[PDB]
From Swiss-Prot:
It comes from Gallus gallus. It is found in: Cytoplasm; Nucleus; Cell membrane; Perikaryon. The lineage of its organism: Eukaryota, Metazoa, Chordata, Craniata, Vertebrata. Associates through its SH3 domain, to the p85 subunit of phosphatidylinositol 3-kinase. Belongs to the protein kinase superfamily. Tyr protein kinase family. SRC subfamily. The gene is FYN. This is Tyrosine-protein kinase Fyn. Thymus and spleen. Tyrosine-protein kinase implicated in the control of cell growth. Plays a role in the regulation of intracellular calcium levels. Required in brain development and mature brain function with important roles in the regulation of axon growth, axon guidance, and neurite extension. Role in CNTN1-mediated signaling. The chain holds residues 85 to 139 of 534 of the full protein. Residues 2-56 form the SH3 domain. It comes from the Eukaryota.
Length: 56
């Protein structure tokens, strides 16, 4: 349920994951898979996956 800003730019590896850019805002919907987390961007509204150590 918590939010975060992108620490550095990123570009989707499978295409079911989400791409990002320095200082873009996002929020976590689910973290339970440990390694990859269900994310949504707040700036645009795009939803997908990211690797968890991107913020954690």
């Amino acid at each position: 349920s918590t939010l975060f800003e992108a620490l550095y730019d990123y570009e989707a590896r499978t295409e079911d994951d989400l791409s990002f850019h320095k200082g873009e805002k996002f929020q976590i919907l689910n973290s339970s898979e440990g390694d990859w987390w269900e994310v949504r961007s707040l700036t645009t509204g795009e939803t997908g996956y990211i690797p968890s150590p991107y913020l954690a």
